[PDB]
Design a protein around this ligand. Sequence first.
Ligand code: NAG
Ligand code: NAG
Ligand code: NAG
Ligand code: NAG
Ligand code: NAG
Ligand code: NAG
Lengths: 49, 49, 476, 468
Amino acid sequence: YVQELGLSLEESRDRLRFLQLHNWLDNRSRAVFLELTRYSPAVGLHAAV
Amino acid sequence: ELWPWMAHVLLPYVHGNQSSPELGPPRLRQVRLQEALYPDPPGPRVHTC
Amino acid sequence: KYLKSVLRELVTYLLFLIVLCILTYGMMSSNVYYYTRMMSQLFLDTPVSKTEKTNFKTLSSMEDFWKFTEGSLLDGLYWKMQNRSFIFYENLLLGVPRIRQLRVRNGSCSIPQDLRDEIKECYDVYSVSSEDRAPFGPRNGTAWIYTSEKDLNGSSHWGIIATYSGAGYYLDLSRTREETAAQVASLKKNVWLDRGTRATFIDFSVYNANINLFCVVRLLVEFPATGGVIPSWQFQPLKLIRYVTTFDFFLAACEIIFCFFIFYYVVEEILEIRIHKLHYFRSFWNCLDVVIVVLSVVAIGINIYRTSNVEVLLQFLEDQNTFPNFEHLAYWQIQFNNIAAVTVFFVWIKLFKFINFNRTMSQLSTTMSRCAKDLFGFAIMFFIIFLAYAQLAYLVFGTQVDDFSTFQECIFTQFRIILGDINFAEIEEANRVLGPIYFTTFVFFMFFILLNMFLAIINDTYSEVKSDLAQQKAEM
Amino acid sequence: KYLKSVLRELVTYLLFLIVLCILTYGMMSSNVYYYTRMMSQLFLDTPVSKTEKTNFKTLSSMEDFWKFTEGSLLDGLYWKYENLLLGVPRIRQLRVRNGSCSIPQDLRDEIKECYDVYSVSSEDRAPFGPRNGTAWIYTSEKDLNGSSHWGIIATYSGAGYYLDLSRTREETAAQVASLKKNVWLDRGTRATFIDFSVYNANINLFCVVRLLVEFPATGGVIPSWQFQPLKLIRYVTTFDFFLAACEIIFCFFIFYYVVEEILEIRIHKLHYFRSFWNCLDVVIVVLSVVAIGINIYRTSNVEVLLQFLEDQNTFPNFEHLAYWQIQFNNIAAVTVFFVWIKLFKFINFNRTMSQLSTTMSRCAKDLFGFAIMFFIIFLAYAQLAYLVFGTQVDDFSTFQECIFTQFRIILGDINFAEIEEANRVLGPIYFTTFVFFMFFILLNMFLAIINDTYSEVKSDLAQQKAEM
Ligand SMILES: *[C@@H]1O[C@H](CO)[C@@H](O)[C@H](O)[C@H]1NC(C)=O
Ligand SMILES: *[C@@H]1O[C@H](CO)[C@@H](O)[C@H](O)[C@H]1NC(C)=O
Ligand SMILES: *[C@@H]1O[C@H](CO)[C@@H](O)[C@H](O)[C@H]1NC(C)=O
Ligand SMILES: *[C@@H]1O[C@H](CO)[C@@H](O)[C@H](O)[C@H]1NC(C)=O
Ligand SMILES: *[C@@H]1O[C@H](CO)[C@@H](O)[C@H](O)[C@H]1NC(C)=O
Ligand SMILES: *[C@@H]1O[C@H](CO)[C@@H](O)[C@H](O)[C@H]1NC(C)=O
């Protein structure tokens, strides 16, 4: 089960509060797996975080 | 501690006037395990899952 | 006779050795280590503020740098006497500090058209071909206007990441804290370190008249194009008013005597070229005198160059309200120290020519000389596999371990493995599969299979030499 | 016929060795170690004040010293660590005068004062400040009962400006406050000595404390300390009677041994010093005579120490006992070591031990010959490291430090994190070449020499014995 974390500060924080107070990471909850990306244009390299 | 963690460092990092190269929004794909477990005896563990 | 040739060459060399050792004792004083140690502890090892705990050598952000500049920096530079500033009530801060910035220009790199929408601007890595040269921000003073290298009397530095230039945007701080703080606050207000900055230098110097010994200080933080901050430092205790005491005159006389000895060695080595045998370079005892002579001549030339251009001190002393530019002398001092150290090492090595006074030493010398060819033959096969392991480690782990970050680091890490210093606690997580395999296989094949061949060769050669010289005596 | 003589010397030596071992086990109790550790924890580890985090080991300025002498020192000196002070503490200062330099003419107008490094030829003798008694008037070394110290920077005299504190905190604090109100620690002060004595009747063990804080010419503070416990009762149990009997027996043994040595040297008028077993005995008897002389000197002067539990007001100069008490330990340790070494003379009659000793004997000329070749390169490398890293690494700060750091590198106790950053070239070159030329080349010659000598000795011994 995956969420999108929003696109701006206000919506991101709103979503975080909404899922926190509605029992998202409260149950068994084996793992969370936060992972996004990155790009570096100065050198031309990527990074998988 | 994950909620404060995303509150103070992750959210300022993902969005803002700095660290512009991002190349895609993040994710929070979590796993369930369907087998809610009672808390284990606190302290030194057998180290086996 | 033959006793008047091997003994004259000994007495003419012992005097050279004692003169060189006198100079060596003269250079390295015991009042130098504590000077540098206290300065370093004052500037690098103090927290930027009473709340944070990040000192200079643990900077992690560009915002921490602004906490250091108006913070533990000004707290150390300016001291109230118990007007001029004495850093420890002993070390005089002479002149005014200088802070200089190196920056690049937007659009030096190209973002691909596929994702050109989200990326607005990019800044390339530092290179003199892509260095900004235009005014920025409020174009009022000299901190917002490019100035050439010739107009700063600067030079390259060879930092950790790149080799920075000597030109940039500089600003001279003040003689009192109440003005330097205002200047730095004005610099911080109108953003002066934006995303385009690539390096930032801070320079100043001190005197400490109690023992006549200057000390130049340089602090460098460089922001790579991939983010982060890399701090660096340098403290060099110069000495520019040398002729003050009697011991200085004695050392000058010793240098003159050393120059005469080098001239004598030059003539007495060129006498054995054309007057006598030529191309006699398969000896290793005449290929070492040329090295000593060349290094000594280079050291004499370097000393003459670095003591014949001292006009910076007189220029500063004429007007003592400007920045003293001592950054060039501190480079030639380092080069002179390196050359003198190597020359001393080789002069000490040359002593082996004159220890053959009995059989028990001639046997060891012959044993060392007869196994040199075999050891050289095996060292090639050893070092080929050594370099193969080094490059394998560099390509596999060289991105996430730090210890294998560069080829030299791989070589030194493998040497420390041979010493048994480093352990594989961090290699394993870098690669689960090739972590332990590399360590165990390297230890197995370079600790008691290919490392014991040197022992075998040396033991066998020594036994053979002793047997041969014993059998030679068994016919008398 | 010689077997009985061998047994005679063996039994005499065994009696001597057991007497020596029991006497040295009698002089090493476990109270001194714990007492020194607790005293150090009380006086050093405790912070200067509850609002600061700097103890005595982390002095960094003069104001910190002034805070310490009113904080932890008074706290641990008159405690609520159950020891009791005897006499009165003394605080002393050594300073130089306002000129040593021929300050350069170039910038003579900007700097007005010099205070060079400490030297007896550059020491201040005039009175300074509010001239009042002892704290502000020079007192010569002879009149001050003092002597040299050999601190960390230099060696300090015994003279200086001294003041004796009091027996109660309430006015010792007042004295220190008076010394602080006036500027008693100018820029010219080069070192400061604090010392006192304690008894701790709970466990019968005196202690002599010295605390030295010295200010180099370049600013800063280098603290140092010295705790030495003493025991000057020597009568608590009849076990001390056993120790006295053992000492008398040891004196008789040494008298007998010097008699035997003089007989054996009158038999051999010369050439008697080329056996290594006729020479070791001379070292044994010489060191034993020195030890007995030091012990009698140190036990003769005890009456001064006992008459200070009477709550009087004078400084007990116990610096002399705490020095001979250390020299006695140093001499006794070497005596015990050499006596234990001398046992090889007797167990060398077993055939295998005889073979091993012969192997050592017939390769000692090659090992010493190769040691010179080893140490020439060792000293060249050490001096190169001293010249390159001598101001930045603290392991190469002085020459003998370079020697010991290289010896530690041989075992594999290097860090290399600060050698490389000290010098990015000639830093790694030195390390790599040193490791190569020691581990791969030079340290194998010792093995080759020992192996070859052992093999040829065994072959010769077997061949010679086979003729029977
Ligand atoms: C740098 O130039 C790019 C165009 O190449 C532009 O989009 C960007 O805004 C410029 N940066 C600033 C600070 O104006
Ligand atoms: C330059 O600095 C001066 C300092 O007073 C001030 O006027 C302003 O910050 C800058 N700009 C101009 C135009 O002076
Ligand atoms: C560079 O050196 C010259 C003297 O040759 C001096 O006049 C000038 O001020 C120096 N440059 C700077 C920026 O101070
Ligand atoms: C130190 O001596 C210099 C000249 O010898 C004098 O000008 C200065 O006032 C003296 N300072 C003190 C504190 O005595
Ligand atoms: C010095 O001694 C005099 C007389 O003994 C006394 O009046 C004066 O207060 C003393 N100085 C100080 C600082 O107490
Ligand atoms: C120092 O001088 C002699 C040393 O024998 C002695 O009479 C005197 O009491 C000693 N102590 C002093 C003067 O405090």
